[PDB]
Amino acid sequence: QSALTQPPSTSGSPGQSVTISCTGTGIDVGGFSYVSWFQYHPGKAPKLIIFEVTKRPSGVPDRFSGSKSGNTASLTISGLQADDEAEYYCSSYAVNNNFVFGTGTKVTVLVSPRPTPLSLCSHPRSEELQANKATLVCLISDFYPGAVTVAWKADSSPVKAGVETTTPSKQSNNKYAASSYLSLTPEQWKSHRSYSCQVTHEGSTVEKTVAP
Amino acid sequence: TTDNIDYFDISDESNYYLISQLRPHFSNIYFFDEFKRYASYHTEIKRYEDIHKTKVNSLLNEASRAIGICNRAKNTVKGLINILENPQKFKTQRESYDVKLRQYEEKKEAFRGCLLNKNRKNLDQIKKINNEIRDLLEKLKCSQDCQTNVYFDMIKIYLVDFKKMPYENYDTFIKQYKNSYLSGVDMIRKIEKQIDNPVTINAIKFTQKEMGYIIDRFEYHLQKVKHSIDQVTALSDGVKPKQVTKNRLKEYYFNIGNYYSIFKFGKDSLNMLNKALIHKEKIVHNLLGELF
Amino acid sequence: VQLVQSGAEVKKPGSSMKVSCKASFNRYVFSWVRQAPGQGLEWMGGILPILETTYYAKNFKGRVTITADESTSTVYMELSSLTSEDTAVYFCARDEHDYVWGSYRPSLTGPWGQGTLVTVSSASTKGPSVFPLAPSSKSTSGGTAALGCLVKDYFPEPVTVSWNSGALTSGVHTFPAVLQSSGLYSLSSVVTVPSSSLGTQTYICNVNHKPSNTKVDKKVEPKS
């Protein structure tokens, strides 16, 4: 039937607990005792964490424990660790050989510092301006959490055309990275005094500036 | 050569209710019979003869009256199965196998839909009694401090009623069947190219096409009974609150009754799906021996 | 046991794509689950080759077809009428037990495939236009100035960027690509080198885009 319900975000401190839910109907969750859970790392294959509502597979640590009561199944991860930070899906068998998943619950670990992003802005090069194109390369790195908002100001005037910003990406040192670009024309480049790249992160905005 | 086709059930488009050829046809009627025992306790809703005599019996009679309108369709498919699953009776007439195969699918779906279309108003009455049970349960003097003693006095009874059903025997019987059924599929698929027996092999294929459908239906209630057995067992060991809200108790009564009615609904079907499975396998044991 | 799927595929919109899933006794059911970017897992359908029954989710009515070959134990999933929303990572997941896992089939508590990514895009194969981002001597950021290369307009992903033929590793930071509205990709790679070496040491970024058979080496020099 309809996709199962899961909260998009759940938090928990290391050494404590966290509880996520899985709401369904009487034809998928509330119908059968076959409700499974899955820990998902992006890029790789999921891993079965819970089978038959409460049976644990081989190798799964004993702190993972699921349950259900009527129409809402719930999984509880006790003693959180750095490896537990992933997306957690729930699933259930349905009538007529149907199988439905959940919306996924992003689990986060509160055991980490929160550095502010370090922005590096690069002005257009002489080779790019000679091809009737202009791209301002604004680069963001070393920020936790991975949630930044980029704003561009063309000579103290907010510019919205030609802006392309990537989604955050976790780095090798467990921090996140992002980048933004501003497509312009050589006339617009040689017209203003200077451009800026404002990046707001956790209420604090860091801005860089380039000029011809 | 089967003499009964009561294993055929149909589900509505909403997939909430289930209609079966065996009485009381609906899973919710068993829940209505159990709700009379719930109302037999509380005095503020002790007037239970009105629900039993008027709504429930007329619903059970209107359900039994509805299936009688599909009797011609039931007797039509019963004749087509006995002819198709027996090559000696199929070869008496000269209709081709592929034509009889297409007629079986159309004549059977018309009989299944006859059980659903002739009970659309009965399904609308099923909702009328569920809202009637909720509107009647409002008459309790309790509100936020409702006692659950009768709720847990019932669970003790439901655990005893579950012990009479042999789940382990049904679990071993179905696995015994699916192994002898799948092994027969590999045997036919290995000799169909080396054996020149079209009228018999195709009839053996027609029997296996039904057997897989019965296992799909026999396992459904088995999953639902496992739900009724596992959920109620956790209620006797989980939290035992002495006081809940009036709306939470309405969710307490409609929960165990939905589990027990489904349990008693699965116990009746599996008792029939047992003989329905064995009969189809007795034919294969004789259709295979006739093949060799 | 283990499952092995085919490599990454890049198909044009409207075309037909098939994905394989080779397995190491094929009585189990074989499902197919994807995840669109920023979306959740979605079951598509299964197939019981012993009974020759094929299941399909309601959201996929006729667009997905599942075939199975007993000779090689390979289950195939073919998706017709490909749109830009079908770009996802497609998995194949078998059941835990064979027909005897109670009655939970299609259960997906069995082994999974390694994963196959499918990129549906209308853009054509194009080589990148690399531009050298000169190190800004005005902002040395404490003596460790930064230079880099701009990989603009390339398709498809990915591109491998190296500096000094891999000899220079400290300070290198290649940022993930951006997807422009024109369907083309763009990224950058920046190194952090001391400013004293900006006037004597040569720095050459090496961008390799194998799908287009293109490789560009740009000489990043100070502004002059």
Numbering used by the authors:
A (entry chain F): 6 to 217
B (entry chain D): 171 to 462
C (entry chain E): 7 to 30, 34 to 233
Q: What are the paper's exact sentences on this?
A:
The parasite adhesin P. vivax Reticulocyte Binding Protein 2b (PvRBP2b) binds to Transferrin Receptor 1 (TfR1) and Transferrin (Tf) on the surface of reticulocytes, which is critical for red cell invasion. PvRBP2b interacts with TfR1 through its C-terminal domain (residues 461–633) with a buried surface area of ~1271 Å2, and with Tf through its N-terminal domain (residues 168–460) with a buried surface area of ~386 Å211. Here, we isolate and characterize anti-PvRBP2b human monoclonal antibodies from two individuals in Cambodia with natural P. vivax infection. To further elucidate how human mAbs recognized PvRBP2b, we structurally characterized several antibody Fab fragments in complex with PvRBP2b169–470. We were able to determine eight crystal structures of PvRBP2b169–470 with antibody Fabs with resolutions ranging from 2.45 to 3.45 Å—PvRBP2b-241242 (3.15 Å), PvRBP2b-258259 (3.05 Å), PvRBP2b-273264 (2.55 Å), PvRBP2b-253245 (3.45 Å), PvRBP2b-237235 (2.45 Å), PvRBP2b-243244 (3.35 Å), PvRBP2b-251249 (2.90 Å) and PvRBP2b-283284 (3.15 Å).
253245 binds an adjacent overlapping epitope and makes contacts with α5, α6, α7, and residues S184–Y186 of the N-terminal loop. Our structural analyses that show all four antibodies binding overlapping epitopes are consistent with the results from the competition ELISA. Superimposing the crystal structures of PvRBP2b-241242, PvRBP2b-253245, PvRBP2b-258259, and PvRBP2b-273264 onto the PvRBP2b-TfR1–Tf cryo-EM ternary complex reveals that these antibodies cause steric hindrance with TfR1–Tf. The ability of these antibodies to directly interfere with TfR1–Tf binding is consistent with these antibodies showing inhibition in all interaction assays. Crystal structures of PvRBP2b-241242, PvRBP2b-253245, PvRBP2b-258259, and PvRBP2b-273264 show that these antibodies bind to the PvRBP2b-TfR1 interaction interface, and therefore inhibit through steric hindrance with TfR1. 241242, 273264, 258259, and 253245 competed with each other and were inhibitory in the reticulocyte-binding, FRET, and IP assays. 3E9 shows steric hindrance with 241242, 253245, 258259, 273264, and 283284, while 6H1 shows steric hindrance with 251249.
